[PDB]
Design a binder for this molecule. Sequence first.
Ligand SMILES: CCCc1cnn(O)c1[C@@H](N)C(=O)O
Length: 280
Amino acid sequence: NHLSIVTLEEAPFVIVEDIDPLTETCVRNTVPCRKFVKINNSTNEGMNVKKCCKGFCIDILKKLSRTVKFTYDLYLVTNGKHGKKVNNVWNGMIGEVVYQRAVMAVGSLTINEERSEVVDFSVPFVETGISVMVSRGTQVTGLSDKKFQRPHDYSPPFRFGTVPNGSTERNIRNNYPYMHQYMTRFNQRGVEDALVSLKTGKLDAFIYDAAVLNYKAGRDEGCKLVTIGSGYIFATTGYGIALQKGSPWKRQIDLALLQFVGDGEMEELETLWLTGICHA
Ligand SMILES: CCCc1cnn(O)c1[C@@H](N)C(=O)O
């Protein structure tokens, strides 16, 4: 009854480190996690590489394993990231669950309606949504600011973007086509790229998952970043653990999460991994 569980690196929720080759054992607050890695860029031939995983979501998984009394084989997703339907097929962590390669998915995984059609989710345990990060000093009200609505009213035309394939991009693409097609010229490879662009005056605003942006603003070195809610209340949600549609384990996973919330364990984890120092 070893459970196959998929995850994905995104600090501080999931952080991946190398194993000690002397022992090949994960130690401290880490747990073993493997990744299938290709031999070359020609075919899908590959081998699994042992790594170690830690972070807020890993600590949640550890608590769940302890409380619900299961063991698991944790692996990192190799095709896609969080989850997107591409060419009519779900990839990422969502895909691993949909096609029953994983019983659960644990990480910075946003609950939404489209995903809920094909997987079940636990109760949310981290609040999230769409937020906007800017350099401290920049003034925006949220995504309805004229700077976002009419970017060519500004010099240079207002520069804002997100990271492709996340639920944030999907929420914009599905509802505001002009905004989406304007934004794509400012696509960011990841959060770290975007933060550098903001701090060096090469980008005006970065639109992304709120939980991660709140975290990054909270401990930016120099406290040079500000996050504000998009105001897209329709997108307010949370991270959840994804399970198979109709999973018999949602009941017990939820009970455990609710136990942790009630007894202060969740509060302790938030203090340990998420709380910031930068005043807003
Ligand atoms: C690398 C993109 C991550 C992202 C952007 N928005 N949202 O919601 C996510 C991620 N939390 C997700 O579940 O798709």
